[PDB]
Amino acid sequence: AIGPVTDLTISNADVTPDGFTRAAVVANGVFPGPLITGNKGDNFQINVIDNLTNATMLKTTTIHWHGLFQHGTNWADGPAFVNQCPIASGNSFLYDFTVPDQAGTFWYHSHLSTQYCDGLRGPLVVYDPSDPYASMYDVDDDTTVITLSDWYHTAAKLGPAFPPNADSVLINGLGRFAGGNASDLAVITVEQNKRYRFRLVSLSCDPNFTFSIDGHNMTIIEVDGVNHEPLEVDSIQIFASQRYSFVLNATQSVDNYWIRAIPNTGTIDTTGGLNSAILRYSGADIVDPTANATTSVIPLVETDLVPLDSPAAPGDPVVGGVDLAMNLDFSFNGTNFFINNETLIPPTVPVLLQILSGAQSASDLLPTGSVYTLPLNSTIELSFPITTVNGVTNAPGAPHPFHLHGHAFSVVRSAGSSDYNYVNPVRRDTVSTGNPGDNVTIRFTTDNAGPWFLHCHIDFHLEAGFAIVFAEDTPDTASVNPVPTAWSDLCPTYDALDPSDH
């Protein structure tokens, strides 16, 4: 598609992906936003131009590049009031970062409040010119990126704080709803005998999908950017913001098959052509698939995923055997979520800026009680217990997929299991915290200077303040992250704007 140097033009326009036309916030006119492409070691320069006129979906914007470590470029990370002030309408801003150590599938989405649910979301792929799996597949390009997105007929700010379900599930940006127009479905074409590398992206706001293909199989090689040992899989449970790359061996008779993406919540049912896309072998008739969905006997299990390189998790194999152990006490008061008796209500001055202003200790950072300081070259173990309590159950709205910015973590203990794995646990940038009784525990090493966000990636929870910030190596933040003029120009230019022009 575009990149590695290009412009993202962000504008308000009416779009109709499910048969229903509604105004949205979109990148380069099309939803989901255009595929940004680059190679390992390429220097990305993305000139985000803000041309927004609809106040109700926010005229100001900021884009995060999910899964990209952003070393030396913490300013360019995205999160509003953590890493930068939002870009004003009528202005433009350049995101100038190199990606030297990273190879695989990512995505980019607006990180200002709930804007990305209103449309500002697109896939982002970095390709590896020496990809250890290039002798597995024949095709990998634009028409192999499969984008799963939940879609809403009512706008983010206009509907409830916590939407119960999506109106439609969009595959490659095309799906249907209940009393649906029965309009266009997504069409993925394949040639006989040819291997396909499919890059599966979850641009979801809330629901998690059970992704499956009729009469076929998926061989996962990649989870959330990180290269993993090949896995035999029937169906993939992909939580919000997660990514998977699977190689599909096109070995079945020339026919139309269903590409299925059942969400966990909402209208679960293939009848109507809802939650579906078309897998069409080249030469079969331009009709709807008549294929049926079988039961899953070899489904995706997290604990089964093993990293391709450097599989051992940091820290010695012990519960607590780590430099800094931290446990997150969750709770919910009706409107807002809480981590350690605190909620993230975003400060006037970005967490980053605060450090460049000379702030150092956790006591001096804002918001207070929510910014934790982490020393460098120390190993960190986090744990997300979803508990049933005395009869209360903290953190409803489960399961919650927690994402850590600027790091790829080893998931030593996964949802649904109580065993700990330190020898070769899966390595990813967002993990499901699961259901009550799951003490999901993750480990990662502090190899990145600057402030980083840790939040549930269900965007409606994010807005409820289910988040904390890691001020990782505060003394070196200033120096290790050189800030361009455009970035420092943002906060004085943004605070001048009226709530009307927000």
Ligand X SMILES: *[C@@H]1O[C@H](CO)[C@@H](O[C@@H]2O[C@H](CO)[C@@H](O)[C@H](O)[C@H]2NC(C)=O)[C@H](O)[C@H]1NC(C)=O
Ligand Y SMILES: *[C@@H]1O[C@H](CO)[C@@H](O)[C@H](O)[C@H]1NC(C)=O
Contacts to ligand Y by CB under 6 A: 216-217, 297-298, 333-336, 343
Residue nearer to ligand X on the CB measure, 123 or 315: 315
Q: How many CB atoms lie within 10 A of CB 290?
A: 10
C-alpha dist (Å) from residue 20 to 184, 385, 437: 12, 40, 40
Interface with ligand X, residue 326, by CB under 6 A: yes
Distance CA 24, CA 41 (A): 34
In the complex, the smallest distance separating the C-beta of residue 463 from Cu ion, rounded to whole angstroms, is 10
Residue nearer to ligand X on the CB measure, 57 or 371: 57
Q: 22 touches which of ligand Y, Cu ion, ligand X, none (CB within 5 to 8 A by kind)?
A: ligand X
Residue nearer to Cu ion on the CB measure, 219 or 441: 441
Residue nearer to ligand X on the CB measure, 319 or 497: 319
Torsion angle (degrees, nearest 10) of CA 448, 453, 458, 463: -170
Establish whether 405 is a catalytic residue. yes
Interface with ligand X, residue 30, by CB under 6 A: no
Q: 56 touches which of Cu ion, ligand Y, ligand X, none (CB within 5 to 8 A by kind)?
A: ligand X
Catalytic residue among 262, 461, 468, 470: 461
In the complex, the smallest distance separating the C-beta of residue 254 from ligand X, rounded to whole angstroms, is 41
# chain residues binding ligand X, by CB under 6 A: 18
Conformation bin of residue 184: beta by default, left when phi > 0, alpha when psi is -120 to 50 = beta
Q: Find all residues with CB under 8 Å of 367, minimum gap 6, and list them.
A: 342, 344, 345, 346, 347
Interface with ligand X, residue 325, by CB under 6 A: yes
Establish whether 228 is a catalytic residue. no
In the complex, the smallest distance separating the C-beta of residue 329 from ligand X, rounded to whole angstroms, is 9
Q: 461 touches which of ligand Y, ligand X, Cu ion, none (CB within 5 to 8 A by kind)?
A: Cu ion
In the complex, the smallest distance separating the C-beta of residue 77 from ligand X, rounded to whole angstroms, is 27
Q: Find all residues with CB under 8 Å of 418, minimum gap 6, and list them.
A: 439
Interface with Cu ion, residue 407, by CB under 5 A: no
Catalytic residue among 188, 457, 460, 468: 457
Radius of gyration of the chain (CA): 22
Q: 343 touches which of ligand X, Cu ion, ligand Y, none (CB within 5 to 8 A by kind)?
A: ligand Y
Interface with ligand X, residue 331, by CB under 6 A: no
Interface with ligand X, residue 40, by CB under 6 A: no
Q: Evaluate whether 15 touches 21 at the Cβ level (below 8 Å).
A: yes
Residue 303, SS3?
Answer: helix
Q: Which of 2, 319, 362, 483 binds ligand X (CB under 6 A)?
A: 319
Q: Evaluate whether 386 touches 434 at the Cβ level (below 8 Å).
A: yes
Establish whether 457 is a catalytic residue. yes
In the complex, the smallest distance separating the C-beta of residue 251 from Cu ion, rounded to whole angstroms, is 34
Is-cis flag, bond preceding 299, omega within 30? no
Q: Evaluate whether 455 touches 402 at the Cβ level (below 8 Å).
A: yes
Q: Evaluate whether 231 touches 253 at the Cβ level (below 8 Å).
A: no
Containing H/E element for 146?
strand 145-151
Q: Find all residues with CB under 8 Å of 76, minimum gap 6, and list them.
A: 65, 70, 83, 84, 95, 96, 97, 487
Catalytic residue among 49, 64, 85, 198: 64
Q: 467 touches which of Cu ion, ligand X, ligand Y, none (CB within 5 to 8 A by kind)?
A: none
Residue nearer to ligand Y on the CB measure, 115 or 343: 343
Interface with ligand X, residue 54, by CB under 6 A: yes
Per-position x/- string for 450-479, each x denoting binding to ligand X as judged by CB under 6 A, each - no binding: ------------------------------
Q: Evaluate whether 436 touches 246 at the Cβ level (below 8 Å).
A: no
Angle at 338 between CA 332 and CA 339, to 5 degrees: 140
Interface with ligand X, residue 340, by CB under 6 A: no
Distance CA 470, CA 449 (A): 10
Q: List residues forming the annotated binding site for Cu(2+).
A: 64, 66, 109, 111, 400, 403, 405, 455-457, 461
Q: Which of 59, 66, 199, 407 binds Cu ion (CB under 5 A)?
A: 66
Distance CA 333, CA 343 (A): 10
C-alpha dist (Å) from residue 473 to 223, 294, 348, 366, 428: 28, 51, 22, 16, 22
Interface with ligand X, residue 187, by CB under 6 A: no
Q: Evaluate whether 6 touches 46 at the Cβ level (below 8 Å).
A: yes
Interface with ligand X, residue 57, by CB under 6 A: yes
In the complex, the smallest distance separating the C-beta of residue 169 from ligand X, rounded to whole angstroms, is 17
Distance CA 478, CA 484 (A): 12
Q: Which residue is nearest to Cu ion (CB)?
A: 456
Distance CA 369, CA 366 (A): 8
Residue nearer to Cu ion on the CB measure, 71 or 461: 461
Per-position x/- string for 454-493, each x denoting binding to Cu ion as judged by CB under 5 A, each - no binding: --x-x--x--------------------------------
Positions annotated as catalytic residues are 64, 66, 109, 111, 400, 403, 405, 455-458, 461, 466
